[PDB]
Design an enzyme around this catalytic site. Structure first.
Site: not given
Length: 532
Positions: A107-108, A187-188, A313, A428
């Site tokens: 992720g970013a 997630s992503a 989440d 999450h």
């Protein structure tokens, strides 16, 4: 037994062998194998040039550029397209035809060793499967797009696809079965896994897939207006926003670390939920993603699939929108809640916001406690961001599946976080430490029940990877996980108490009804990492 130097398409690689027992068992560990040439900013990845000799793959390479929530400095490096492999080994001969699990995670933005979630040893050894972890481009460097030829976007996806195609071409040499690749990620990474199974580019490469808290149908998984965001970050770094072509050329040339830092996640009070600002995500480019994901399920028809979410989440995210949720001192009003829903329901304006505030406040029995209101805020974001899109993805997969299985779960092991409220369930990414066997790798920080959940999760996950059925394979399982059916809407609830009552039915079907029926009918008015 142990692999020596393994031959890959670009040349030989050598890792290290870690002895696991007196029985002669071990695990071959390869770290830092390039699966592509160092990528050019905002361009699709290309094969890495061939090399002579033996590449010493003995340590993790820097991951791609990203930043923490403070967003003051970048981490990683543009030269980051490397992968890592764990191959469990027996005594007599090196492993062969083992299932291959490719972890898609990245992720970013990070919030919290940094390669904690990139180590596949516990998973590979407890489940007897090969685990491949790797780095892909994230944030603007990974997903900037102008919505056209000038910058099609989806770079991080192309990177993932590159890693997948590489594993497909080279994993046999490591003892893996090329026709037994399982993509898993949260997630992503979870949405990425989903998107990869839906992309025509991955035809014939994927056998099974596991989406943890993220599917391609998630609202935050597809950017509907990439040009708007491309122009914003461009202007922020001093680029021409007049015409896409010149803007794209400038973005490819601007300082990658400045470009990265320019991607901001506004932690201060904002009109819209934070997820609105995580704009650099996949786009329907008409190429890697040739249409809206919902219409691409025929591509995943023969891919076994497990998709699930966590109890709470949405907590991580809503807690950024409404910090008072975590504070037992501060209170939350119906107003604060209405503001939250309106931000999340912009598309349907006032009516959409009213219908939503109504449904979510109905269980308040007009005398709701603070804990009740805060819990409802969590449920709202859990529903919109994860639960609902996962429910339809699972349903879509089941309905179109041919010779593929479909399973779904709800991870509800309560958070051990002292900072969060006592009523906190699974936030999450809480599942990660269990999926990656941290209760075993780093035991002193865990209790017996954590090892129980981890053992169960790795068992189900690795079993699924081997057979397409979480119940059968290398490990025994604590409870019978039934495959998802449309009529029953059954899911396994994963937590410390895996027993006869673990399989449950119809999770929040009333809320699924609201969103897919009520809401959609309304007229349109307008050490964890998050984001793509």
């Amino acid at each position: 037994a142990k692999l020596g130097s393994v031959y890959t398409e670009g040349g030989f690689v050598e890792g290290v062998n870690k002895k696991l027992s007196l029985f002669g068992d071990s695990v071959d560990i390869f770290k830092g194998i390039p699966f592509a040439a160092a990528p050019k900013a905002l361009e699709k990845p290309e094969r890495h040039p061939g090399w002579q000799g033996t590449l010493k793959a003995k340590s993790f390479k820097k991951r791609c550029l990203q930043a923490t929530l403070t967003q003051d400095s970048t981490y990683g490096n543009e030269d980051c397209l490397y992968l890592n492999i764990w191959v469990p080994q027996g005594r007599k001969e090196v492993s062969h035809d083992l299932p291959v699990m490719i972890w898609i995670y990245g992720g970013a933005f990070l919030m919290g060793l940094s390669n904690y979630l990139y180590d596949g040893e516990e998973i590979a050894t407890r489940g007897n499967v090969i685990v491949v972890t790797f780095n892909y481009r994230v944030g603007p460097l990974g997903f900037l797009s102008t919505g056209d030829s000038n910058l099609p976007g989806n770079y991080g996806l192309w990177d993932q696809h590159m890693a997948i195609a590489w594993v497909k071409r080279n994993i046999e040499a490591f003892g893996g079965d090329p026709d037994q690749i399982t993509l898993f990620g949260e997630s992503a990474g979870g949405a990425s896994v989903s998107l990869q199974t839906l992309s025509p580019y991955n035809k014939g490469l994927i056998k099974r897939a596991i989406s943890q808290s993220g599917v391609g149908l998630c609202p935050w998984a597809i950017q509907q207006d990439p040009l708007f965001w491309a122009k914003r970050i461009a202007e922020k770094v001093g680029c021409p926003v007049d015409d896409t072509s010149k803007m794209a050329g400038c973005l490819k040339i601007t300082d990658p670390r400045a470009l990265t830092l320019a991607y901001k996640l506004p932690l201060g009070s904002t009109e819209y939920p934070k997820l609105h600002y995580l704009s650099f995500v996949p786009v329907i480019d008409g190429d890697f993603i040739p249409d809206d994901p919902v219409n691409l399920y025929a591509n995943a028809a023969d891919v076994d699939y497990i998709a699930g979410t966590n109890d709470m989440d949405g907590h991580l995210f809503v807690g950024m929108d409404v910090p008072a949720i975590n504070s037992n001192k501060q209170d939350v009003t119906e107003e604060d809640f209405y503001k939250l829903v309106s931000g999340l329901t912009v598309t349907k304006g006032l009516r959409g916001a009213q219908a939503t505030y109504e449904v979510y406040t109905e269980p308040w029995a007009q005398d709701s406690s603070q804990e009740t209101r805060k819990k409802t805020m969590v449920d709202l974001e859990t529903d919109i961001l994860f639960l609902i899109p996962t429910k339809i993805a699972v349903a879509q997969h089941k309905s179109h599946a041919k010779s593929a299985n479909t399973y779904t779960y709800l991870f509800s092991q309560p958070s051990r976080m002292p900072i969060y409220p006592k009523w906190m369930g699974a936030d999450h990414a809480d599942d990660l430490q269990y999926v990656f066997g941290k209760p075993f790798a780093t035991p002193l920080g865990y209790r017996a029940q954590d090892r129980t959940v981890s053992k169960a999760m790795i068992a189900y996950w690795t079993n699924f990877a081997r057979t397409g059925d979480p119940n059968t394979g290398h490990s025994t399982v604590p409870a019978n996980w039934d495959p998802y059916t449309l009529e029953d809407d059954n899911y396994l609830e994963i937590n410390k108490q895996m027993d006869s009552n673990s399989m449950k039915l119809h999770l929040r079907t009333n809320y699924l009804q609201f969103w897919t029926q009520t809401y959609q009918a309304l007229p349109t008015v307008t050490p964890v990492v998050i984001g793509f």
